[PDB]
Amino acid sequence: MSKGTSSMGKRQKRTHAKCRRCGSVSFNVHTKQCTSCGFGKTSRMRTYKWQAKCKY
Amino acid sequence: MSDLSNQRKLASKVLGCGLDRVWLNPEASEEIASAITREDIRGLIEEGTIKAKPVKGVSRGRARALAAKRKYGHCKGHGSRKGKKGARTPKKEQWIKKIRALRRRLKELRADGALDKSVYCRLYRKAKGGEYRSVSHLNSHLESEKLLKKE
Amino acid sequence: MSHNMKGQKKRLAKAHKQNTRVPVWVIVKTNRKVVSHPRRRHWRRRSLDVK
RNA sequence: GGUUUGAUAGAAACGGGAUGUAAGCACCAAGGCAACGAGGUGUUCAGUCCGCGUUUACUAACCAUUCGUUCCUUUCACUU
RNA sequence: GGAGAUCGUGAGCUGGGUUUAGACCGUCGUGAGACAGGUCGGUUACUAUCUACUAGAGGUGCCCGAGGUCUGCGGGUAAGC
RNA sequence: CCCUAACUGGAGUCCGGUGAAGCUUACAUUCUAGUGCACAGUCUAGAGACCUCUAGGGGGAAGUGAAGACCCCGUGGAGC
RNA sequence: UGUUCGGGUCGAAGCAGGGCUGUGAAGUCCUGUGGACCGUUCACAAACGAAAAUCCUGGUAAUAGUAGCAGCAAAGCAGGGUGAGACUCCCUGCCGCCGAAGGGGCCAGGUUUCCUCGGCAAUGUUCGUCAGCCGAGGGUUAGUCGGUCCUAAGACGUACCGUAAUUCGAGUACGCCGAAAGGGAAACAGGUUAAUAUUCCUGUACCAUUUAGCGUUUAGUCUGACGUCUCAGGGCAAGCCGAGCGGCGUCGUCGCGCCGUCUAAGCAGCGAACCCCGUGGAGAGCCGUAAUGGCGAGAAGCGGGCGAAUCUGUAAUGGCACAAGUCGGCUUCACCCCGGGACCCGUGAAAAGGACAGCUAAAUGUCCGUACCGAGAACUGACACAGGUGCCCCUAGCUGAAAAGGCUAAGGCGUGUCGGAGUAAUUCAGUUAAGGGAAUUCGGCAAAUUAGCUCCGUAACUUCGGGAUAAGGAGUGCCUGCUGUGUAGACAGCAGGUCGCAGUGACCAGGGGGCUCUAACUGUCUAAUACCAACAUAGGAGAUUGCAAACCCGUAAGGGCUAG
RNA sequence: UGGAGGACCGUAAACGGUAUUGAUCUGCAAAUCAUUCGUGUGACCUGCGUCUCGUAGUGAAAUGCUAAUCUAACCCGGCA
RNA sequence: UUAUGCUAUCAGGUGGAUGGCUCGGCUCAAGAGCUUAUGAAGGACGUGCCAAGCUGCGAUAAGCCCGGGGUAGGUGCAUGGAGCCAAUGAACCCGGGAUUUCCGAAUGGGACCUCUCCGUAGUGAUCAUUCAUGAUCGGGAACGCUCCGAAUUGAAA
Numbered sequence A: 001m002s003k004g005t006s007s008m009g010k011r012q013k014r015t016h017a018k019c020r021r022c023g024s025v026s027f028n029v030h031t032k033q034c035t036s037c038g039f040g041k042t043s044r045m046r047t048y049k050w051q052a053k054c055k056y
Numbered sequence B: 001m002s003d004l005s006n007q008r009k010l011a012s013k014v015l016g017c018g019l020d021r022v023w024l025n026p027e028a029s030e031e032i033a034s035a036i037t038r039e040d041i042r043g044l045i046e047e048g049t050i051k052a053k054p055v056k057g058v059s060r061g062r063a064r065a066l067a068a069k070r071k072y073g074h075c076k077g078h079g080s081r082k083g084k085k086g087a088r089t090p091k092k093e094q095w096i097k098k099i100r101a102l103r104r105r106l107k108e109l110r111a112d113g114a115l116d117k118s119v120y121c122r123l124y125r126k127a128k129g130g131e132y133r134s135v136s137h138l139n140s141h142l143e144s145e146k147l148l149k150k151e
Numbered sequence C: 001m002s003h004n005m006k007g008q009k010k011r012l013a014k015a016h017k018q019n020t021r022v023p024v025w026v027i028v029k030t031n032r033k034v035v036s037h038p039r040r041r042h043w044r045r046r047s048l049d050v051k
Numbered sequence D: 001g002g003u004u005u006g007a008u009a010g011a012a013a014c015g016g017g018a019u020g021u022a023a024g025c026a027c028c029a030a031g032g033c034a035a036c037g038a039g040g041u042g043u044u045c046a047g048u049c050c051g052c053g054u055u056u057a058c059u060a061a062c063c064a065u066u067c068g069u070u071c072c073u074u075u076c077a078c079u080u
Numbered sequence E: 001g002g003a004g005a006u007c008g009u010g011a012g013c014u015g016g017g018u019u020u021a022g023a024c025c026g027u028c029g030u031g032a033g034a035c036a037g038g039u040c041g042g043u044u045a046c047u048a049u050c051u052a053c054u055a056g057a058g059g060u061g062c063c064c065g066a067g068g069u070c071u072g073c074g075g076g077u078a079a080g081c
Numbered sequence F: 001c002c003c004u005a006a007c008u009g010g011a012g013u014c015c016g017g018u019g020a021a022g023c024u025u026a027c028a029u030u031c032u033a034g035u036g037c038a039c040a041g042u043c044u045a046g047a048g049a050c051c052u053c054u055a056g057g058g059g060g061a062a063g064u065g066a067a068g069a070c071c072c073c074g075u076g077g078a079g080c
Numbered sequence G: 001u002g003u004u005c006g007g008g009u010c011g012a013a014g015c016a017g018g019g020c021u022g023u024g025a026a027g028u029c030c031u032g033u034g035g036a037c038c039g040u041u042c043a044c045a046a047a048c049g050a051a052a053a054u055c056c057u058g059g060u061a062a063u064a065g066u067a068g069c070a071g072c073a074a075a076g077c078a079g080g081g082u083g084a085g086a087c088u089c090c091c092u093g094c095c096g097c098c099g100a101a102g103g104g105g106c107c108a109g110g111u112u113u114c115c116u117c118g119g120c121a122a123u124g125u126u127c128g129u130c131a132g133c134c135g136a137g138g139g140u141u142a143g144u145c146g147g148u149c150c151u152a153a154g155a156c157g158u159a160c161c162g163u164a165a166u167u168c169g170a171g172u173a174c175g176c177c178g179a180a181a182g183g184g185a186a187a188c189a190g191g192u193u194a195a196u197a198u199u200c201c202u203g204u205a206c207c208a209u210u211u212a213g214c215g216u217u218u219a220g221u222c223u224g225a226c227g228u229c230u231c232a233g234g235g236c237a238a239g240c241c242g243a244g245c246g247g248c249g250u251c252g253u254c255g256c257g258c259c260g261u262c263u264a265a266g267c268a269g270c271g272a273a274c275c276c277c278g279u280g281g282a283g284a285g286c287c288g289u290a291a292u293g294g295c296g297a298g299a300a301g302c303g304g305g306c307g308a309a310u311c312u313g314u315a316a317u318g319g320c321a322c323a324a325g326u327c328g329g330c331u332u333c334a335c336c337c338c339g340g341g342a343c344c345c346g347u348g349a350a351a352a353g354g355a356c357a358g359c360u361a362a363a364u365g366u367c368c369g370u371a372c373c374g375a376g377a378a379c380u381g382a383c384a385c386a387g388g389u390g391c392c393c394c395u396a397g398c399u400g401a402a403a404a405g406g407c408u409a410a411g412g413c414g415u416g417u418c419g420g421a422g423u424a425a426u427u428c429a430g431u432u433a434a435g436g437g438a439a440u441u442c443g444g445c446a447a448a449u450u451a452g453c454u455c456c457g458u459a460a461c462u463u464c465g466g467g468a469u470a471a472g473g474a475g476u477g478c479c480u481g482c483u484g485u486g487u488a489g490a491c492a493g494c495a496g497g498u499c500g501c502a503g504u505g506a507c508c509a510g511g512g513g514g515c516u517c518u519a520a521c522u523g524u525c526u527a528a529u530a531c532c533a534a535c536a537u538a539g540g541a542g543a544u545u546g547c548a549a550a551c552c553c554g555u556a557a558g559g560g561c562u563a564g
Numbered sequence H: 001u002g003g004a005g006g007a008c009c010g011u012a013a014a015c016g017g018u019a020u021u022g023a024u025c026u027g028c029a030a031a032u033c034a035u036u037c038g039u040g041u042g043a044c045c046u047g048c049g050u051c052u053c054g055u056a057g058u059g060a061a062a063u064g065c066u067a068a069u070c071u072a073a074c075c076c077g078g079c080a
Numbered sequence I: 001u002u003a004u005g006c007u008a009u010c011a012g013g014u015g016g017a018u019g020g021c022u023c024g025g026c027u028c029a030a031g032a033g034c035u036u037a038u039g040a041a042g043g044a045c046g047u048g049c050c051a052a053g054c055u056g057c058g059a060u061a062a063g064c065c066c067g068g069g070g071u072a073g074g075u076g077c078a079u080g081g082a083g084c085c086a087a088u089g090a091a092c093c094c095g096g097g098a099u100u101u102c103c104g105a106a107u108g109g110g111a112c113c114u115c116u117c118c119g120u121a122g123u124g125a126u127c128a129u130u131c132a133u134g135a136u137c138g139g140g141a142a143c144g145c146u147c148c149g150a151a152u153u154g155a156a157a
């Protein structure tokens, strides 16, 4: 259908479930990883230095 | 009289009829207003303050008489056909009934004994080939060409 | 009808219990300083992300 | 424009019109053992209808309010 | 008969041509591409604030109070060709 | 189409309830000519104009929507 | 800020308005408000002075009591209630809408919207005593319904190896997950609540695992387990007709019209086709099917065996106004069983489970879901949104080829949530129009004409298939009486009479022909300005490569093509 | 007799989107509605599941599509 | 009584500026500095007489036990009703213990299922020894060490 409100009626599925380790709704049900804390990918918790300004 | 929609729904569930098919008596509004349980509604139905209006069907007498006339052979002219021939009588059914009748008649003529094997085989394949259009037609040819062993 | 497991139903029950008007005695005791909480919603609005 | 000192609007009856001969009843009807029978003829220029007229007070035009005094003050020629 | 009025007139209309994105033919270019050449296709937004005009009303001004009948300062006309 | 006419339903017109948004420096009852960055309701000289309200189609406010898509410029970009 | 001198509840800062001073930035005083802090000399500092940035944040005008509350489904009126208050809430009568969807069942999704009572500030395009709104309380019960169990595409984990290194990377081995529409052990009827019911209660059943007793394998096969089209046979829910019985309606005349006349699983019995076996002896030919066909490598016929849906009895006493409750017949899809044929340069899943050795008895059968909506108001698009998800699966009578269009049942609604009044222009969508008939316009755009079925007749051209519904003509209603085919349902045909301007009388339902350009055709395409001559295609041709190949991905380990 | 075909007609079943250059254009709608149309037994339409993605994917090829964004997506950082 | 209006001031509405106050923020200096398989940080769910949020706590659940300090009231943010506790020394503060649901390094198997399967009550993976046992895994504001490693920008290109 149209790219606007006509194709937004098929919006009945879900792509992210709820994570066990952090409780945030960011668990990818296809790749089986949490996109916020990294659960499923690793035993460590996801942190990147680009999640904040260079502190200078 | 007050909001009696609740008793309407309850009576419909108890009776099983549709909502608009329930008839709440308009002089007994005070007494119906106190009915709040299924037991009370059953008591009310027994006393006659409630009931179900009869269903009005679709009458069929006119179509019935028309069907009788058509069954006699009338009211079916060219001006009433509106579907292609074949939609009114598929050709395969016509062939099936024709050939089954012809074969049963030939089989019974063989069975009783007035038709030997040779002429039976010839007539069987001939009717398969489509040279007789009806049982009377076949009987006419049998009684003309003498192939039956009647005595 | 969204067949749920035990945990999903548990979280749904909690999110149901959070829709409550603040108790009247709380409003009396705090002298009309607490009159609402940020957990109030309505079912036909923004969907909750509990599940 | 009219308003009882009245035909302004409506009802009733009649004139002038529109359509096309109402329902029931009687006789006939191709036929059918019968039951039934599309339909025709008579009662019947019939029935139905009129955002037109005439006659006729039969019902309704009744009952009232308001301006033509600055308003209170006796800043009044009023009036208890 | 010929001209003018933002080559009068798209908050009146139309969309044929030109002037987007697609493609074909010819000629250029090694090529991406181009033609000032041809051909087919291709969205026309707005509830009128102010003023102007066309008609209809309510006031106030002149005035004894009210009503009636007129005059005519002016305006218009093609009323006929 | 010559050449338009009557009729039907929904809006509009009138009354009750509910109830927004977009243009807006200020003033503003205008018309003609000139002048002026050469396309003025506001300047110069004339001509007109009693005020308020309703309806109506859009002549004008170089009407509103929008830091031009056409052309040029930038020792600005991107793709090929 | 350092320092000197002070003011204030006998009223500080701040705010509104005034008097005087200074060229000015500004200072000081007075009056009203206010209720606790504020200055000054000499110096020093700075997050130090706003009218403008299509400036930022907050508040608030005009527009304006204006647009909208119409277009696809034009719906309400009378009488009686409740209430402070009634076009809008409730009951009855009339009049209406959908009726192959606006009804019923449910996935995903929602998450309490479900039921009762009490309210109306806000929400509801108006009001409201109403409510999917606001407050309080209540509601979901399983060995048999699902998940759970098996595996498909395909994921994930551990190890091995690579990488400077990992949370990174292909493969191999071992595991483990992946379907609420694939496979699958087992339950039906009735009652009960305000809201739950194959779950609770009554009755009648059934299936597994363990323990005990009584016996035993064949253990290797079968099943689960399979495409598209087409057709015969049997059965059945729905549907229809006749007779009797019980109700309701109509009743100006007649005597018709409608509703009901019910009964589950389980258990016991029977078996149509295909197939297997014993006889049989058929050809200058016999036996069959809707059709294909079969036969001395053994037909017809005659016997026996394995073998379906459904049907018969019981369960049969439950429900019904304990009112009747008895019988026959026709048809039957869109559902079940069984068998045949055709087609493929397409061949149309796997595993758990089940069957073959079980019988009797008691005990056990944990866990999770279960309310309600499933959409023109419960989902998604910011909305009580004319879109989309779901038209996903089902549906009665007449007309008719029909699930089309029209008219009605059952069921759901008068909420595709503003009313009154009836009088201008203009506007959206329709009905009709004398005479002419494209003269309009870039252009027959737009609208009109034709339209069903039967019969007759049918051109140029042609790849011989077509063109073709070519073109062009005639018939069609109703009544009376019949004939033919067929087991029947039904279908086909005839003779006479007769009405109207008109007989597919409404609904539905092609206008046709000729000459050119272009692409062979069916197909694809710029979601939201381009459905075309563009892309694709079958057909034609060329090139590389003999597999540790050609071509390509990776840093590597290793891979795609390649089960070739 | 038989029942083949990227055959024919045709549903507001389903999928698509020609023309009106109609309605709406602060809309019912950040692409819908009405009539008129094209395919409708197949190179068909479709539910659920699973895989392929940023100098990369997918594309019967338009620079189309990759969450209202595509001649190189989006979030944060270099970045004041 | 001149309507619709224009200018100025006053009274009131709406609104929340100014002033005064401030258990908050920010910067500098001095100290102090690891924790977890004896199950951490973080999360989900539960827990109160009337209890929705936050805070605390964990089926012993705004909490239990012991020692010291403290002395007459207590029941968190949050002075409401009704109750209870406390001179057997409470509340509160300092030190030490106990209980400590499920997920999570998460570790018997499995997660679009924070629960579920077999219960064989569970040493998950990699390692060292005498083979009793022991070690590593996650978190931490910045600081520390090793390895891999751009472009905008400047040069007025």
Ligand SMILES: [Mg+2]
Binding pocket: A003
């Ligand atoms: Mg997009």
Ligand SMILES: [Mg+2]
Binding pocket: A053, A054, A055, A056
């Ligand atoms: Mg840093």
Ligand SMILES: [Mg+2]
Binding pocket: none
């Ligand atoms: Mg103009």
Ligand SMILES: [Mg+2]
Binding pocket: F075
């Ligand atoms: Mg330069």
Ligand SMILES: [Mg+2]
Binding pocket: none
């Ligand atoms: Mg300012």
Ligand SMILES: [Mg+2]
Binding pocket: none
């Ligand atoms: Mg209907």
Ligand SMILES: [Mg+2]
Binding pocket: none
């Ligand atoms: Mg309201």
Ligand SMILES: [Mg+2]
Binding pocket: none
């Ligand atoms: Mg599984």
Ligand SMILES: [Mg+2]
Binding pocket: none
């Ligand atoms: Mg109206």
Ligand SMILES: [Mg+2]
Binding pocket: G519
């Ligand atoms: Mg083509």
Ligand SMILES: [Mg+2]
Binding pocket: none
């Ligand atoms: Mg091509």
Ligand SMILES: [Mg+2]
Binding pocket: H010, H040
């Ligand atoms: Mg078609």
Ligand SMILES: [Mg+2]
Binding pocket: none
């Ligand atoms: Mg940036």
Ligand SMILES: [Mg+2]
Binding pocket: I154, I155
């Ligand atoms: Mg440079």
Ligand SMILES: [Zn+2]
Binding pocket: A019, A020, A021, A022, A023, A024, A026, A034, A035, A036, A037, A038, A039
């Ligand atoms: Zn997480």
